[PDB]
Amino acid sequence: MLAREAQNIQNPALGAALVWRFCCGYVKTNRVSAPPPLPFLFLVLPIILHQETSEFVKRTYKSSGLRAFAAKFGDSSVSKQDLLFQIHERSIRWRQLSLRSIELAVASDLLKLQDGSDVIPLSKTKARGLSDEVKTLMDLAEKLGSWFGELSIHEVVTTLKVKL
């Protein structure tokens, strides 16, 4: 009753598609086409399903790199350096939701969870008839994956001030 709205608006059947796009975009720009580490999968929804950070991801275009996205938060004209630290806390808060999204993702043959703390994305699948609004979250997830691809673990952890 007091949770129907939230349960409908944050259902894992959307997180699964978001993670699928994130992996498919991470493999493309990886140096040796290796699929991403497992921990980074937990950082997809806590950034795309929060409006104030999704707008930042939307503004700086592709060739800016993750560093520009991180820097926008500390800009004097914006002054939102606190949200950067809160990204990690919010990611902690939503462990179960992302976990279920990953479960649905693999069980639908969208990702193969190798026995190496790694997840191979899959090609040859396309949806149709979706709404315009989600059709932007999908591209945002893909762009974020591409940004994550170009860098290494240590650089990403330092840039987003995450603690794994």
């Binding site: 409908n8 894992p12 500390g74 479960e103 693999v106 639908s108 969870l113 240590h154």
Partner: protein, 631 residues
């Protein structure tokens, strides 16, 4: 702040050779035996260019021709970082840069490509130094005055710091010293800002409270004449006993509260117009009720109209996030297996079935015509309510017109109207006065607000006064002077036992001679000027290292220190290098010195903490001869 240089790197312009690397050592005196030629060194230009300089001072004759990219490696509290800048080429300056980070850099890319721009690197350095917070704080570049001693400044008695030849630069540095000394801090700036805001708030609060208190008090003074006037009007049944403020006030509230006033007019005698006037008054009292009810109904109807549309929007915003569960149904396979081990498991199928069922329910709820019927009925009722309100207003107009005509005809009607008008307005004035007097009671929030704001101002004043920016500075300078003296006990000077002082405003040293105090400008020979420069700068860097969060990078560059001597003299230079070594070893790897000098290996050979390798030769020779011959 831990920030040191590990090495320099060059990328040959001709794409047939490996990049050339010159590797320094952390936490020791790096004696680069070089500069043995006319012209300037090639190291300082590169370091300055890589850290975001606006111009290229690199020798264009013999270096800029052979290499395409320049770079340095810096060890910082966040690990190691490689910075690189593209060779300007046909323009005096350029902004392309490349950045890399790691725990310990070990591989240098053969090919470099643009990664960022100079402004980004300046922002990065500012953040690394804590200089992006709320004069107060400098920028990174302004700190150069503490870490560089050019050739014509290292033994010059009329100049002590790099970049102090213009009015603007001198004022900048003079404003900056207070922050670097640790007197000013971010928290004090924030506290000052907050205290100013609180004071500005309290001013206005007190002003308005005082005005309201005046207005209420002057009326509470006239309360007695007001009460006598009330008794005259007959609204208050006149008492004859003595009454205090409480009794008169109370009586006034009961008078106000009545559904009607005590008309001091007899009813046994009725004229022709009195009954008509009373009937009209009662009829208007009646119509008021219907009009109010219609108003209430119309308001609620509009509010419902808004709520319905908002809920309509919510439904679609809820459906468009669930729709995708329909597509996830078509890709799931006939079998059902565990995500981890592949064991038979249908949980995902149940989840997708539940979601598709919810989607179906929501889509059914969005039925159009079933809902589109409701607006028709809603509109049908809105018009009825509006027309009824219009009729009520028309009746009110008619009754008012009749009352006006009747009171115009007779005479007693006019007198009765005058009496009622006077009594009503008197009651209204008393009502407002009593309300405003209620607001300003002892427990009224309007008093506690001011009291708490005063308390906050008191506390903030106490805090900001508990730690002053002058005593901090004066206590900081004492230890710097003492350390400088201790260092100076070892070097060569005319009078080692005379303490010195550093003058913040003057930007120089002041030797406290027994008979007189002499500025550094009036002490002879370079052997003394070099000693004083060394002592002051080393003591300053020790201080900056012994304190937390200071933004001064912990490395120092000394260009050609021994030129005062011709590059009997061995002992003095040996003592200088030995003092440098002692200071650097005492800091346990947190302080780096880079020295460019000609002095042979026999003066700094066997000194602890001093290292110099013969491969580092600078100026031209750092370019491999292979490139010099190929190009």
């Amino acid at each position: 702040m831990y920030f040191q240089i590990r090495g320099i790197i060059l990328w040959p312009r001709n794409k047939n050779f490996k990049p050339h690397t010159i590797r320094f050592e952390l936490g020791k005196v790096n004696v680069i035996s070089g500069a043995s030629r006319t012209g300037k060194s090639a190291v300082i230009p590169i370091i300055d260019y890589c850290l975001g300089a606006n111009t290229c001072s690199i020798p264009v004759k013999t270096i800029r021709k052979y290499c395409e990219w320049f770079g340095i490696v810096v060890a910082t509290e966040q690990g190691e970082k490689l910075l690189a800048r593209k060779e300007p080429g046909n323009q005096r300056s350029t902004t392309d840069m490349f950045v890399l980070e790691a725990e310990n850099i070990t591989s240098i890319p053969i090919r470099l490509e643009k990664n960022t721009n100079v402004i980004a690197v300046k922002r990065m350095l500012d953040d690394l130094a804590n200089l992006s917070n709320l004069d107060g704080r400098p920028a990174f570049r302004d700190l150069a005055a503490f870490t560089f001693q050019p050739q014509n400044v290292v033994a010059n008695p009329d100049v002590l710091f790099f970049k102090t030849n213009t009015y603007e630069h001198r004022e900048k540095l003079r404003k900056i010293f207070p922050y670097v000394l640790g007197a000013i801090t971010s928290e004090l700036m924030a506290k000052q800002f907050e205290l100013n805001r609180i004071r500005l708030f309290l001013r206005r609060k007190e002003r308005e409270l005082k005005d309201a208190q005046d207005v209420s008090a002057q009326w509470l003074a006239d309360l007695k004449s007001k009460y006598s006037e009330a008794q005259e009007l007959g609204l208050v049944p006149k008492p004859q006993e003595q009454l205090s403020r409480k009794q008169m006030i109370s009586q006034l509230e009961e008078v106000i509260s009545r559904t009607d006033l005590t008309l001091k007019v007899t009813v046994s005698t009725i004229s022709d117009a009195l009954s008509e006037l009373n009937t009209l008054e009662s009829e208007e009292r009646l119509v008021s009720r219907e009009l109010t009810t219609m108003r209430h109904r119309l308001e609620e109807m509009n509010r419902l109209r808004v709520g319905m549309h908002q809920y309509e929007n919510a439904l679609l915003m809820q459906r468009d996030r669930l729709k995708i569960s329909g597509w996830l149904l078509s890709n799931t396979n006939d079998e059902s297996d565990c995500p981890m081990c592949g064991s038979h498991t249908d949980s995902a199928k149940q989840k997708l079935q539940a979601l598709v069922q919810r989607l179906s329910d929501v889509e059914a709820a969005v039925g159009a015509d079933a809902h589109k019927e409701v607006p028709a009925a809603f509109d049908r009722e809105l018009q009825r309510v509006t027309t009824e309100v219009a009729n009520a207003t028309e009746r009110l107009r008619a009754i008012q017109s009749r009352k006006r005509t009747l009171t115009s005809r007779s005479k007693e009607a006019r007198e009765q109207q005058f009496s009622t008008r006077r009594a009503e307005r008197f009651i209204g004035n008393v009502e407002s006065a009593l309300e405003l007097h209620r607001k300003l009671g002892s427990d009224s929030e309007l008093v506690e607000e001011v009291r708490k704001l005063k308390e906050m101002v008191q506390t903030l004043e106490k805090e900001l006064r508990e730690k002053d920016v002058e005593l901090r500075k004066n206590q900081a300078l004492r230890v710097i002077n003492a350390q400088a003296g201790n260092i100076l006990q070892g070097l060569d000077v005319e009078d080692p036992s005379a303490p010195i002082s550093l003058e913040i405003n003057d930007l120089t040293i002041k030797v406290l001679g027994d008979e007189r105090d002499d500025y550094l400008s009036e002490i002879g020979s370079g052997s003394n000027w070099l000693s004083y420069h060394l002592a002051i700068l080393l003591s300053l860097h020790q201080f900056y290292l012994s304190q937390k969060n200071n933004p001064v990078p912990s490395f120092l560059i000394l260009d050609q220190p021994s030129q005062v001597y011709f590059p009997e003299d061995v002992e003095a230079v040996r003592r200088a290098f030995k003092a440098m070594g002692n200071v650097v070893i005492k800091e346990k790897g947190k302080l780096q010195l880079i020295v460019l000098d000609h002095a042979p290996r026999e003066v700094w050979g066997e000194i602890d903490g001093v290292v110099g390798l013969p491969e580092w030769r600078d100026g031209i020779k750092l370019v491999p001869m292979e490139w010099l011959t190929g190009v």
